[PDB]
């Protein structure tokens, strides 16, 4: 599914990401725009042997299990395939777990280079949510 911006904003807000552990809404929308261009089916093979799945590019070394990555820890107890869905629920549930660590949103490299220090609330402006 490739989500619209406003459409992603209102979905994420239904899924409880506005102000979750200190990150405002715009953070999440911006992250998804640079991490996967709002495409729920996006996948990226990493050089280390891991793959990044879905709209928030969740990594198979640490968070989900794709059955093909060496020191796989599966910290979100979920097959990676579950994050390639139009329903964002499992992606959000895992993302909520990832950000509850002291690194916060810094786990997401695109958000880190393109979102942190930017007016991230621009991403939810001009939307009915």
């Amino acid at each position, epitope marked *: 599914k490739v989500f619209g911006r406003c459409e992603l904003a209102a979905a994420m807000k239904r899924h*409880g990401l506005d102000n979750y552990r200190g990150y405002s809404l715009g953070n999440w929308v911006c992250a998804a725009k640079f991490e996967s261009n709002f495409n729920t089916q996006a996948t990226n093979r990493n050089t280390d042997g891991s793959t990044d799945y879905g709209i928030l590019q969740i990594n198979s070394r640490w968070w989900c299990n794709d059955g093909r990555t060496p020191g796989s820890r599966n910290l979100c*107890n979920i097959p990676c395939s579950a994050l390639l869905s139009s329903d964002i629920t499992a992606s959000v549930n895992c993302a909520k777990k990832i950000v*509850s660590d002291g690194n916060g949103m810094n786990a997401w490299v695109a958000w880190r280079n393109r979102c942190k220090g930017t007016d991230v609330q621009a991403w939810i402006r001009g939307c009915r949510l």
Partner: antibody
């Protein structure tokens, strides 16, 4: 499958440090998210803190910095250290994973002179 | 901190009726409200996550709804295995907090 278990003293003197251990079987404690919760007499539950994947920790400010949570990768246990206890620390302590789906059984710790 | 208030504090029910328990949050916490059950001489058991997400292995008669500040947990026809304490908890902010609990008892 995951199995958790608390252990330690059931009786402590005021002002000492209460130390508790949680043994995990069925998964490496390394990298995972682990917590401690307590239930006071009168059913109040207090979330005490958690350790996470990077090793960062989050502690309830009600504990005013007398808490430490620590893990030892080789024995596959993680710990609770609570300094200067008082009678207000009397309670049922539980160990549990962050997700809340595996809890140990609990251990009553009474603080008395 | 986010204070979570539960009502009623006590609820008696003859097995087979339906019941719903509230949990109100002092501030909006989105969908970040979970529910637990605690029977006597036992550990709390996760029933519902993220306000309405079902959890494998728990009876389908339990269900939750709400968002923002108002959450409810419903029990379709109380079975005698259901009596005990019910607690809600939020994970939106740090320190995580629990509500005062509701006691569910045979009438």
């Amino acid at each position: 499958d995951v199995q958790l278990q608390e252990s330690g003293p059931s009786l402590v003197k005021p002002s000492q440090t209460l130390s508790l251990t949680c043994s995990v079987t069925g998964d490496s404690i390394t990298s995972a998210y682990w917590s401690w919760i307590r239930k006071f007499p009168g059913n109040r539950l207090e979330y005490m803190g958690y350790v996470s994947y990077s090793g960062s920790t989050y502690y309830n400010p009600s504990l005013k910095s007398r808490i430490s949570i620590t893990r030892d990768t080789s024995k596959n246990q993680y710990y609770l250290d609570l300094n200067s206890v008082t009678t207000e620390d009397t309670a049922t302590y539980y160990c549990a994973n962050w997700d809340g789906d595996y809890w140990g059984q609990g251990t009553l710790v009474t603080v008395s002179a | 901190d986010i204070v979570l208030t539960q009502s009623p504090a006590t609820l008696s029910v003859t097995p087979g009726n339906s019941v719903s328990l509230s949990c109100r949050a002092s501030q909006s916490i989105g969908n970040n409200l979970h529910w637990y059950q605690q029977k006597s001489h036992e550990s709390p058991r996760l029933l519902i996550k993220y306000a309405s997400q079902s959890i494998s292995g728990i009876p389908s008669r339990f269900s939750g709804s709400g968002s923002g500040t108002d959450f409810t947990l419903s029990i379709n026809s109380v079975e005698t295995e259901d009596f005990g304490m019910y607690f809600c908890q939020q994970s939106n902010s740090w320190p995580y907090t629990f509500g005062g609990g509701t006691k569910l008892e045979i009438k």
